[PDB]
Subunit: 337 residues, 4 copies
Amino acid sequence: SNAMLNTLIVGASGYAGAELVSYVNRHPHMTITALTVSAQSNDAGKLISDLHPQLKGIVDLPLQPMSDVRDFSADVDVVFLATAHEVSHDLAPQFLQAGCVVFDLSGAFRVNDRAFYEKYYGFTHQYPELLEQAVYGLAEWNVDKLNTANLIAVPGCYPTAAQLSLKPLIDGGLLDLTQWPVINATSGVSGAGRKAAISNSFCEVSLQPYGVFTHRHQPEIAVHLGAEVIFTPHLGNFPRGILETITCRLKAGVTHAQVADVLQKAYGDKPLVRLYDKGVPALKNVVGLPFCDIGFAVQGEHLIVVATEDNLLKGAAAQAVQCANIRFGFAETQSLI
Amino acid sequence: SNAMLNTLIVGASGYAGAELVSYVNRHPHMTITALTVSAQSNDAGKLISDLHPQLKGIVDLPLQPMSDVRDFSADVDVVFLATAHEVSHDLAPQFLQAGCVVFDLSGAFRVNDRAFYEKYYGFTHQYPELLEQAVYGLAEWNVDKLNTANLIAVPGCYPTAAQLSLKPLIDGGLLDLTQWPVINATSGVSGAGRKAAISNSFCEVSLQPYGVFTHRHQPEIAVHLGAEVIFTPHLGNFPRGILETITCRLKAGVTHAQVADVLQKAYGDKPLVRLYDKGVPALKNVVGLPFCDIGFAVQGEHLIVVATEDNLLKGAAAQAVQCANIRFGFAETQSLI
Amino acid sequence: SNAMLNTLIVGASGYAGAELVSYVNRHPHMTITALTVSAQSNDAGKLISDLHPQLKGIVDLPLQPMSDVRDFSADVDVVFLATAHEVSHDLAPQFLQAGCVVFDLSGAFRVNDRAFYEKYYGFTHQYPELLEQAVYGLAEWNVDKLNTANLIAVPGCYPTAAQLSLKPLIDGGLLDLTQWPVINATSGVSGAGRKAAISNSFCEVSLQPYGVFTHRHQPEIAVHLGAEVIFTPHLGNFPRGILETITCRLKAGVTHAQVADVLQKAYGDKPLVRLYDKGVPALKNVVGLPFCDIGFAVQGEHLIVVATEDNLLKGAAAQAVQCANIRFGFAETQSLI
Amino acid sequence: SNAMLNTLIVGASGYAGAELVSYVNRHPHMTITALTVSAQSNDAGKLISDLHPQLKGIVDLPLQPMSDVRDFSADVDVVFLATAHEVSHDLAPQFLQAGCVVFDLSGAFRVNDRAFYEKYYGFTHQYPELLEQAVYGLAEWNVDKLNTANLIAVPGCYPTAAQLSLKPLIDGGLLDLTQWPVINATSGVSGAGRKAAISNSFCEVSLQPYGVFTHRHQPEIAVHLGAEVIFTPHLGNFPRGILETITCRLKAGVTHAQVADVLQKAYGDKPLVRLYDKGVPALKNVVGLPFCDIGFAVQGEHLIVVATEDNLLKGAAAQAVQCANIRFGFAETQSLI
């Protein structure tokens, strides 16, 4: 075989980072060179399995404070950035410059539009040439570009299930888009990230919509689909998983059979998608697994699509690794299954 | 004062029945004459506080098997039926005939249409004159008829929050009804009722849509609103509460201010409704309380209304008691607050 | 009647403070004069029902930053301190000095021993005369002293159920104390308090023992019982409630009947205790209620006592109000039930 | 390599059976010959992934009703019985007679004592020679006998963590056994099994002790340890996992270091045990994993051991497969990790 890919995981101490660590550890063609945290992190020097004891005895590497990319970039092939948007914006170009392939899990390179970063992210994007270079890592729809991508912008968790549901229907011309698709989505609390805040504190969670008409995932979905949507996320009191219920109006004459044919053609041979021929998925059946599960129902001109994923897996870390498998010529689900 | 109303609670051993017991026990103008179960119930002779130990030392009355209404109807003023639809269909007329006022919590008398009971309930309704007599117990909108009603058909749990949200908007002419309102609703598991079944068994619950395009609450909502809706319920893994996220298209030119004015005019003086002027409610803040909490947001021609209630309280028992307060001239929230 | 007692609630923005607010609001003989937070609190000026929206429309008073006790002490009869130990140590004497009756919910005055505060609380107690004056607010066992107390040290949540279980057995001479009682206790996360910390963050909670051989509640229990115990608390993933399973060795010849007689004599007429004659309580049946529920089982010389309470109610706010009822001559359960 | 072992899974439709299916499916040296249910099962003909949709696309084999063992025994090497005790008692001998190796997950062959089955299981054991032949599948302590066992009685879920904690301490002479170890254990609801019953129904679960002084796991633990224990199980409201807090008195002079040495010697090289050198495990860190995690603390003559496992994995299916690996010469953790 070729040598294992030397892999750096930046922001490894969060929930998504910990899932990346498990996958890379298990991957026969990738090896962890280092796990990093911010320069002045309270978690510097602690073992990843101290913060994430499910990794105890499996991966016990220290979390190294990184103050300069050049202390870690030498002999690195692959960098996963499991960091926040503004850190990723700063870090990605430096790792590219050092000759690394970068899989960014943040929103920093997902949309080829500088004004987008103003409104929804609060900062002026300084790398418009990287906005053009970045490949959107929705893996089922970007295989050819992923093969040669050195900057991969991994989609948001909610956008992943939303677009897997909607894209083949829209590209197939099945939807009357004058009635904007309505995406109602619920996430477990791990999607807020590892952090002491009031709003993800145990007693503060029940069920509540948030980011109503303001969530940064909405424009990501609309721009990439090329169609306006309603997107309403909800925080539910369980740790893991996203379920989306997506309600649309079909074009005149479009049938259940035609929707089924389009989904089957899109995903029949896609190993991370599980299609329900009849009925709709329950969220627990994908938790801990790297799939997106999709079912649907039709009544006259109305369509409801239901999609689930594990928010940390297909919504984040498993999709990142899937993209890496595609990029490096490995079996698409290697380490994931 | 006048004498306390002699009150019989039929089907007292379920979750809604237990909440009725607490309220009636606490009501200064109502007194429990008996609590009943079916003739051959496995729970016959057991104390209500055996099955519902939150009632321990508060109400410890036995659950009496009832095989004939005439064994319980004498000297009864008020009957609450916390029973299933087919039992309620059988029982309500017999209690009416015995001179009782009947508050039915089931679906058996909610819709003035015999064909409705065929499709969605499976039986031929034998009392079409009682379908015409029944007052729909959506208490904020039926005060005048509730004052003289002897048969009250208490609304379903999901229909209550749906119609409190939609009715004043539709009657106000604010909505472009050619885009059917989309009601996405999540309930805690107590809404399935007290029963050993696989689907409400602990390990079987996560988050899943059900009754997709088939739920019997959909026609209840559509018929009473006089407008077609999309209604998708979801079972979530928490015991109590319903949250609904309702997405609509507004008519051209309708503003946030106009929606606010309509809601304020409808509910400003309604003691069981809590209006959020800005932002949307979280489900835990109504659990254990008799309110329906309503907030909303507008962007251009799109409206999202978010409504919460406790499914066993405003969705069932508290609404029943509210109707009884209206019917008998008691303070609207007596015993509820 | 006499005038309502003017009541100040200090540290009102936490979980226990919010429960105090509900009770005092509802109490016919107590009235809220003000709700306070620390001088530089991020929550200053916000309405209590902003942070605790279950109070929406019921209590909407602002949270006032307090920098000097003398800005709030005038015309106050009763002060509830729902604050941390070091704040309570500072504040209680100042409110006493201003002529107020002080119910302290913290640990600051619970134990008449200065060295106790060194080890387990980290500070040098500056008011040893108040350690002698303070009445331990375990309400079932301190009625006579509560009648004349101006400083009440409300017991910890875990200590309350532990001592209600153990005290009558120990005072009755039923236990072979050479085998230390083993108290295994589980609390919901609200017992950690309202605070953004990693350890009470939603995804961080499952079930784990903590404070093993180090918890400050252990000496509180041992000193007040006059006997050494094993005390092991556990954080469980539910918001509210404490269940304790307490395992002891009985003296030779002590029977189930003798244990029952002792418990019945101690609590038969105590309105906040619910005794199970047979079998053991489930935690959900006391959540939202002000009781401590106690059952037990015996086999030969071994005894298991099981006690539950709502950690914010009988474990905190309801016990405080119960003490206040005793102190001011009100019905013991006034506002609680 | 040798041919894959032909494996039959009996009672495959339950929670433990489903975990066996995943492991065997994944095992490179074992292959599923059939999955069976009882002769008149409501689940006959349904696909295992219909009942357990986490298996969708992975294992979709039908659940075959079995009325005669001889319809399934031909060309079977290994039988896993994930069935109830009385079924296992009936079935095990028939499969032995047919030349199969039987791993029984039930209690039917765990204890070499006929009277044991009378009291705690309700039936007269008809195979006392199989009680003598059976190897108790506590895998860390029975390797030599597991190598040649054709009947393996897999330990109960609670007994597994209890004995892994206690056995090396007792055999090492560290404990003053005149104070019976106190085992307080909490399980998720999957440990009650897949079944529609009131007591495992979603709304019925919170936290409650059960089987107080009566649980059939107590004698299993006492007999195999050769010492009397207190064992109190508790049903908690989460699906998966067992945590046990075990409180003992040490012999005079026994130190933390001596306990550590004994545990390290027992389990340092045991791949399914994870030893915490300091502090105690949290239940979520073993859920979904095949380990038993053990930490402990000492103060003077008192010891607390805390052990966790996933109740369906090390408490059931993973231990069964571990035993099978030992029996057939495969790597001890093959398929588990």
